[PDB]
Amino acid sequence: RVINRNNRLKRLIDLGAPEIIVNNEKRMLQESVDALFDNGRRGRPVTGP
Amino acid sequence: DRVLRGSRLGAVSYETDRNHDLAPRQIARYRTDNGEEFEVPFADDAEIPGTWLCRNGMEGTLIEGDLPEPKKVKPPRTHWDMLLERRSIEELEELLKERLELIRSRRRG
Amino acid sequence: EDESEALRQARKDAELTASADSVRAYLKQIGKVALLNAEEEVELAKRIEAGLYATQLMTELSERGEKLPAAQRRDMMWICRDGDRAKNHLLEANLRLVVSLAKRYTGRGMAFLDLIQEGNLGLIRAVEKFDYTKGYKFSTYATWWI
Amino acid sequence: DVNFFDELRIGLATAEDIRQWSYGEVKKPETINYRTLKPEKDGLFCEKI
Amino acid sequence: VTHIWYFKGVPSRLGYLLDLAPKDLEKIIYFAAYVITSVDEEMRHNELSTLEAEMAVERKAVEDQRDGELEARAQKLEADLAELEAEGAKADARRKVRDGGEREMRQIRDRAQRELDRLEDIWSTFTKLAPKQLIVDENLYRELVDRYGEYFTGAMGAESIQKLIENFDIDAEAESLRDVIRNGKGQKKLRALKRL
Amino acid sequence: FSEIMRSTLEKDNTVGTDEALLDIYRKLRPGEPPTKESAQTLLENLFFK
């Protein structure tokens, strides 16, 4: 999840994207790192199957 | 049902862990763009590559100043490419004139 | 009750909430800019293609080229920036189309915001390769790329 | 980690510590080629990294 | 990207280091609200006078529009006179158009008054602008940036938190807290200990 | 007869049925633009629909 969202952010910044999409992607990156260090801490815990 | 047992995808060999002689080997020095140095031990009879992906992760070239001219590829496809392959220059220039006289007739009246 | 100020003040105070669901935060973000119509799309696409031709011609005349006139250079850079404004405006316009197409592919495989962002990237590709002279509504052509 | 110990000093880590710990930069969201069952290059299991 | 342990777990450590509330720091690092990370002092100190002159020019142009409204509906209201008291009609239906244009001016002066209140708010914010402040309400931040684009830098999110940690003397801040526990009392002294 | 009910009726601090409906909606849609047809129906949603 972190690698996908980071690569998507990198291609969005390289391609030139409006501010809404880039800030949404950075919020998704933040939530991915937050789930990596502590899932279930802030908000809904990231579920599996 | 069965069993449980599992294996890492890889073999575990066991030989003599000798240290007295080995295959002799060189040390090459690669360099990134931002002044980072990295040393890579290659074997002696080994064609040393000019560029090498370093421990930092960016592409690093060798400290020997040969520069073998890698002939970096074209930009893949641009918005200018996707526009030009479906229109023409006189049409785009016509629209350029239309916006030019549009901002003209906006500005000075 | 439209007026007085209390019934709308409650709406403004409800607009500034936390809403820790990032999905709902993104929807409250994208509900801001207004949806468009066909003549507006034609106008936007003409502005975008004009700005792209302007920056191509400016790069061509920049190399080996011209001491440009001040008015002509100033407003061709105006066109160059206005094209990008129109591009970002159309992207913002059809974000909601992206959400409405990606809403039915949830429930399996991936999350929801990842699907939204991939639809947005497809929407960028569609607004790059959109033609208007075929005379169609934009959603018909963009749905394929999304 | 031979058994000679006097201290165990934790500390908040910096980015110049983190990219000095590493031996590579993982940059693809791939683990194992589905057909040969060998690890991918620049993935989460790359033998180079 | 901010680390989660120094942000979320109570007591928050970014909050005590930067003197920010967690209820409002979550609005920063999750891209919900802007934060002012720097401001120019002396440029605000003299272009405060120049920009309040420009503000007076702007609100006078607003009042040019507003007495255009007054004069135009005054002319349309004397047209209401000349088409309500010039024929055969009912005594109240001839003045329903009188109440109509007057209610129009009431809601129109409400329009002009609310946008003048918006301009007064954005002027008060640019006067009282400071680092470690939060500009909520996106429209106000966008208007504030593209009219006053110099004089300050202000971003949103973890890179802005990083910029604040870059621009942070810990020593004078620490000695200020030492001075507060040297002299303060009550709630301030307890929070000064908990940040010290 | 109910002294507590007449006491809370005197401490009602809101007159108007829709003026109660909006409070209502704000407390149950915190993060939503209210309108009269929504709070008319969403209270009927949770308990009657």
Swiss-Prot record, chain B:
GO molecular function annotations of the record: bacterial-type RNA polymerase core enzyme binding
UniProt entry tagged with the keyword Transport: no
Keywords: Transcription, Transcription regulation
Biological processes per GO annotation: positive regulation of DNA-templated transcription
InterPro entries assigned: RbpA_sf, RNApol-bd_RbpA
Transmembrane segments: none
Matches recorded under Gene3D superfamilies: RNA polymerase-binding protein A
Subunit structure: Forms a complex with the RNAP catalytic core and with free principal sigma factors.
UniProt family annotation: Belongs to the RNA polymerase-binding protein RbpA family.
HAMAP family: RbpA
Protein name: RNA polymerase-binding protein RbpA
Lineage, opening ranks: Bacteria, Bacillati, Actinomycetota, Actinomycetes, Mycobacteriales
Gene label: rbpA
From Swiss-Prot, chain C:
One GO MF term: sigma factor activity
Functional note: Sigma factors are initiation factors that promote the attachment of RNA polymerase to specific initiation sites and are then released. This sigma factor is the primary sigma factor during exponential growth.
Cell compartments where the protein resides: Cytoplasm
GO cellular component: cytoplasm
Notes concerning its domains: The sigma-70 factor domain-2 mediates sequence-specific interaction with the -10 element in promoter DNA, and plays an important role in melting the double-stranded DNA and the formation of the transcription bubble. The sigma-70 factor domain-2 mediates interaction with the RNA polymerase subunits RpoB and RpoC.
Entry annotated with the keyword Cytoplasm: yes
Keywords: Cytoplasm, DNA-binding, Sigma factor, Transcription, Transcription regulation
Keyword Transmembrane helix: no
The protein's name in its UniProt record: RNA polymerase sigma factor SigA
Family per record: Belongs to the sigma-70 factor family. RpoD/SigA subfamily.
Example GO BP: DNA-templated transcription initiation
Region of interest called Sigma-70 factor domain-2, as start-end residue ranges on this chain: 90-146
Positions of region (Sigma-70 factor domain-1): 20-54
Region of the whole protein represented: 206 to 351 of 528
Species of the source: Mycobacterium tuberculosis (strain CDC 1551 / Oshkosh)
Domain of life: Bacteria
Curated annotation (Swiss-Prot), chain E:
Source superkingdom: Bacteria
Subunit structure, as described in the record: The RNAP catalytic core consists of 2 alpha, 1 beta, 1 beta' and 1 omega subunit. When a sigma factor is associated with the core the holoenzyme is formed, which can initiate transcription.
Role description: DNA-dependent RNA polymerase catalyzes the transcription of DNA into RNA using the four ribonucleoside triphosphates as substrates.
Family: Belongs to the RNA polymerase beta' chain family.
Protein name: DNA-directed RNA polymerase subunit beta'
Source organism phylogeny: Bacteria, Bacillati, Actinomycetota, Actinomycetes, Mycobacteriales
Gene name for this UniProt entry: rpoC
Residues of the full protein shown: 101 to 296 of 1316
